């Protein structure tokens, strides 16, 4: 894994004019790992001391431990001899399954009058929204998998503005082929999300297809649909939304968006 | 990474002038603020004349009006021009980035910095 570092040490010395926040900015993405470093004098409040963001209050909670909003991180706090000072290591993995956060560190020199802070902001987010479905050869179906990775919908304590919680699966009907879409194990999915895809594909009647089972697994929940062969090209748009289903105490899910392209051209 | 290079110190008496330069590379220097530091043995290191990206400037009070700091876009260089020298200015001397929020990828690790040292 590589890691993305934050490296304060020995430069946050100095007493400055006025108010002065030295910043460095992490989004965090292929899994890689975080790193902050910072002189052990310097009072640091970080990971298990964060201020981290919320989006169902839509507010900061500070002092507090990131595990309480991704509980899938785990990070370790370590003192350390670096460039020849007496330094604190603070080291997160981030494991490729760990669910979106959006939290800042503070690293505060004494004696400063407050004027000089460092900063470290994480910003742990999907950043693919738009995906092809995939075939599975062993089970001889594509999928639209939005239970985890890329398209997951799954409540998150992640950083969404209002409009950008939609995430899309296109699938090239094929006909006579199983097609699965997975979504998050949650009671919600099979109360209005099943109706959802059921009045979206029923909308339209020269559509044909046949929902085979809604299948619970270990850790998701699977619509199986069959679509029957059609000669014409047509275009639909199914939307299953969980962005305004919330989670105590910060979470949100996401719009999963299904286009399915019905077409014998190319 | 940032580069720092600084140089014009020396022996100077009270109340003489004095000139740094300052080289600055493996930023953008035309969009960064740019400031002196100074830290004489057993006093922290302070920020003594800061100057923004559109010249802007400020200076601590106890150099207010001796102390002119200058850049120029061209040439990556930041300038100190020290007049009325005095004892208490005896430092060495750093220059580096400065600004209200600085990037920490635009603050370089210190340079050697240049002595300056005030006596009769």
């Known amino acids: 894994k590589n890691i993305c570092v934050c490296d304060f040490t020995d430069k946050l010395n100095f007493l400055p004019l006025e108010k002065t926040k030295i910043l460095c900015e992490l989004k965090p993405q292929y899994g890689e790992d975080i790193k902050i470093i910072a002189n052990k004098e310097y009072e640091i409040n970080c990971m298990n001391n964060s201020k981290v963001f919320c989006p169902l209050k839509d507010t900061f909670i500070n002092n507090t431990n990131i595990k309480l909003y991704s509980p899938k991180l785990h990070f370790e706090i370590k003192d350390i001899t670096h460039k020849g000072k007496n330094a604190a290591l603070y080291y997160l993995k981030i494991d490729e399954e760990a669910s979106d956060i959006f939290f800042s560190c503070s690293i505060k020199p004494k004696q400063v009058s407050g004027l000089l802070e460092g900063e470290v902001r994480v910003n742990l987010k999907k950043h693919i929204n738009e995906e092809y479905s995939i075939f599975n050869e062993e089970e001889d179906v594509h999928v639209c998998d939005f239970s985890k990775g890329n398209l997951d919908i799954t409540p998150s304590a992640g950083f969404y503005l209002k409009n950008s919680r939609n995430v899309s699966c296109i699938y090239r009907v094929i006909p006579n082929k199983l097609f699965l879409i997975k979504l998050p194990k949650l009671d919600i999915v099979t109360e209005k999300l099943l109706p959802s895809i059921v009045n979206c594909l029923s909308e339209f009647s020269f559509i044909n297809f046949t929902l085979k089972h809604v299948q619970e697994g270990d850790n998701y929940i699977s619509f199986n649909v069959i679509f029957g062969e059609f000669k014409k090209h047509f275009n639909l748009a199914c939307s299953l939304d969980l962005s305004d289903f919330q989670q105590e105490p910060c979470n949100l899910g996401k719009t999963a968006n299904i286009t399915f392209i019905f077409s014998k051209l190319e | 990474q940032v580069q720092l290079q600084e140089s014009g110190g020396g022996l100077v008496q009270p109340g003489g002038s004095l000139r740094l330069s300052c080289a600055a590379s493996?930023?953008?220097?035309?969009?960064?603020?740019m400031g002196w530091y100074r830290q004489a043995p057993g006093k922290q290191r302070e920020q003594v004349a800061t100057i923004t990206s559109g010249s802007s400037t400020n200076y601590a009070d106890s150099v207010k009006g001796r102390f002119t700091i200058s850049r120029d876009n061209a040439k990556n260089t930041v300038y100190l021009q020290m007049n009325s020298l005095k004892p208490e200015d005896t430092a060495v001397y750093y220059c580096?980035?400065?600004?209200?929020?600085?990037?920490?990828?635009?603050?370089?690790?210190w340079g050697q910095g240049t002595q300056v040292t005030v006596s009769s």
């Open positions: 493996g930023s953008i220097f035309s969009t960064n603020a």
């Open positions: 580096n980035a400065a600004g209200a929020t600085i990037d920490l990828a635009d603050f370089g690790s």
